[PDB]
């Protein structure tokens, strides 16, 4: 997250860190959203590589003992069948991870609330991106979970020529684009939390930024639109 602020420990309890084994340690690669006690929602592209993955819930600081973490293996990966790793602009950048154990819920560990199917936010709708991604373009991962206020940019504006053009689809949410704040590498797969009728819901799964940089004016961060995938989500969980 470029131009973020450190999140309070209990603001975003559905946020997880998806990590891969890296020698005798684990490295954060992507975000995710706890949606069942044994199911995480993430970006398909976060799991294109043939790695050993684990999920950390109740995680705040990647580099320090928070006293609140639970560490769980990924037992099953279900990627959207239409996902194509060479065509992220096509969409479908969503995957569900079934965890080897059911996590315990507390104030640091909660299910992410999802929008109703079909829900599209009005332009300029208030949202936060959260994650441990780079704090600057070509930068380093955050230690502490960050958040950045990223208002939505509607499909008509986001798919206009000075924004993302044909690259953005109606199956996606755009947010931000102010040249100051954004998603960056390592935020992928994590939530866009948007405030709708008094309640935050996870409307976005972080998918991509410009190749030119994370915080590039009129290249808002693009998210897979959760509300387009409600039946797919339910269908996967119900059969797994
Ligand atoms: Na920690």
Curated annotation (Swiss-Prot):
Required cofactor(s): Ca(2+)
Catalytic residues (UniProt): 45 (charge relay system), 93 (charge relay system), 188 (charge relay system)
Expression across tissues: Pancreas. Basal layers of the epidermis, hair follicle and sebaceous gland epithelia (at protein level).
EC number, UniProt record: 3.4.21.36
Protein's UniProt keywords contain tRNA processing: no
Cofactor stoichiometry and binding remark: Binds 1 Ca(2+) ion per subunit.
Domain Peptidase S1: 1-238
Xref: InterPro entries: Peptidase_S1_Elastase_sf (IPR050850), Peptidase_S1_PA (IPR009003), Peptidase_S1_PA_chymotrypsin (IPR043504), Peptidase_S1A (IPR001314), Trypsin_dom (IPR001254), TRYPSIN_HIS (IPR018114), TRYPSIN_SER (IPR033116)
Family: Belongs to the peptidase S1 family. Elastase subfamily.
Protein name listed in UniProt: Chymotrypsin-like elastase family member 1
UniProt organism field: Sus scrofa (Pig)
